[PDB]
Design a protein around this ligand. Sequence first.
Ligand SMILES: [Zn+2]
Ligand SMILES: [Zn+2]
Length: 212
Amino acid sequence: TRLLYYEDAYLKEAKAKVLEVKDNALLLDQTIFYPTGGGQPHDRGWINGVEVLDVYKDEEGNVWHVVKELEKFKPGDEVELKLDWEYRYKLMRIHSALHLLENVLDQILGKGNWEVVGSGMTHEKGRLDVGYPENLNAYKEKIIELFNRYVDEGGEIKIWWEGEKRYTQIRDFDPIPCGGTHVKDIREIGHIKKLKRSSIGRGKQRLEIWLE
Ligand SMILES: [Zn+2]
Ligand SMILES: [Zn+2]
């Protein structure tokens, strides 16, 4: 599949051709719908005004779109794609926030002194599970301050590829390899509304992040 969302994360609408109709799902030649991966949920939206129920990649890498009304789709149809942009852009803000939070933790705790244990997000909040001994409640204020300062200063998020791995880099910070859709500039993330730390195991800590 041609993954238009990796050519332009801000492409909100596009046209596509139906290649196959298999299992309540449409295979398109190109798509703007992000399929589930990298901790980021799949996009919501509409194809010809029909609700999209799921977007996933098959074992060959191609993207299938489950639709709620199959009857009006046949191979060869030209269809109009429309993202649920409110949902997509909130996920871009939260995904980029998780990257910025990682870079902030490198600055404050030291690269190599902590580990990412897991990562995920919803429309509501992002989750970064970390391996670090000391209770991070003693660092929360400084983390929030530095995060918000970088948001205020701004900075481009650059994208490139190395093999099958997509890389993103905020400003000159350490690059972070992962799939998913990011804002263009960290000014768009906005300030932290809430950062919540919890213990999830010995030396394992969950950071949950909500944006304004
Ligand atoms: Zn990521
Ligand atoms: Zn603010």
